[PDB]
Amino acid sequence: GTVNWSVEDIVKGINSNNLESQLQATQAARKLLSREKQPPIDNIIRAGLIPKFVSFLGKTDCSPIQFESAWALTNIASGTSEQTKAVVDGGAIPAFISLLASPHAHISEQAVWALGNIAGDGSAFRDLVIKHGAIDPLLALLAVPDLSTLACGYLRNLTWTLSNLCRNKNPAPPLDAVEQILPTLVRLLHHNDPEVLADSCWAISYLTDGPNERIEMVVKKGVVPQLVKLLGATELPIVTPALRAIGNIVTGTDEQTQKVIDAGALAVFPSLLTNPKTNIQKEATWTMSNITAGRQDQIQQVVNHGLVPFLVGVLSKADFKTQKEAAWAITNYTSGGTVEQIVYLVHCGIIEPLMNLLSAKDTKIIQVILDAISNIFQAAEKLGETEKLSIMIEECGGLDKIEALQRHENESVYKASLNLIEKYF
């Protein structure tokens, strides 16, 4: 059998001068690396086997040893950066790229997978895979009229590897590589498999995680309507990256934000802002905070969609990280909104939940809240109602909390605290 070989025995077989002995030893190594918990990756490396495996990738006449060596190297490359580096250092990148053209789909798929692990190490190996020319043969595998004719597992591995070529920053992937990949990504983003959709969304989320020029090349491809549809998916693994991507996009320009609104995104946020998963709530409120930082007509669309009561709700009760994003959403709203928009905020009940959060042991939320209160008072001044507002704040325990903050270890806290207490109380 080929089960439970020692490393010593694998070495003896791979050093034989017999391709069939080498194949059996490579299989035994594959099974150590794939069938164990705590696979002995470092022992295999220390035995000097990586260069042998890499040379087996080139044995066109023995497709089984190509497959077994590709799988062994895939799992070595799945480990630590040092283990991935040993695979790269053995010459594996160009050997795997040559295997993308194999007429055996299971071998081409294993090469796709291995290159995804290498690229997933970080930006340097990602860019090194790209420089060895991986993108053209990868995209050629998806150049079919209908994706549904490809094996499902095959398409999932291809999508996953492409997403790693879009992943990581410092630096971001080369502009030319993004432009080359995007048309295929947009196609995968319309495919009816949940895992392909999830990894496609992740890739778009990476590509929109950057400056406005990066966001623009994604938005120009027309993907926002489809992101908004996927935002409505029942599968959490799809909603999570779709929401990340939409959230990134609205950190762009007000015109980029407006594409999200025009596509109907705000209609999904009653559900997102009440979502049972804490992380969805948090990222939805973060997204709202970058919408209320826009233009007054964009704030107005937040109002029209009925979302201000949902922000009051999360400020009133949510995980604290979400409550902090909600505080930011409120300060941005009050900094950019009209007087009538700010009045509406107060009629929805913002004051009390805002005051109760001044009990937080977190310095930054305090400043954010105090700045919003200031902005709300400035709106009342324009109306001559600073008094009714002072009462509201006192009536709910607000003045007491603002007073306590005059004795706060932070500079800008007790200065802004004092200024309100004197100018209005």
């Binding site: 099974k31 794939s34 799992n75 995804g116």
Partner: peptide
């Protein structure tokens, strides 16, 4: 999403 994936049995 996972940065790296082992092919396991």
């Amino acid at each position: 999403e996972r940065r790296k994936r082992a092919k396991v049995e």
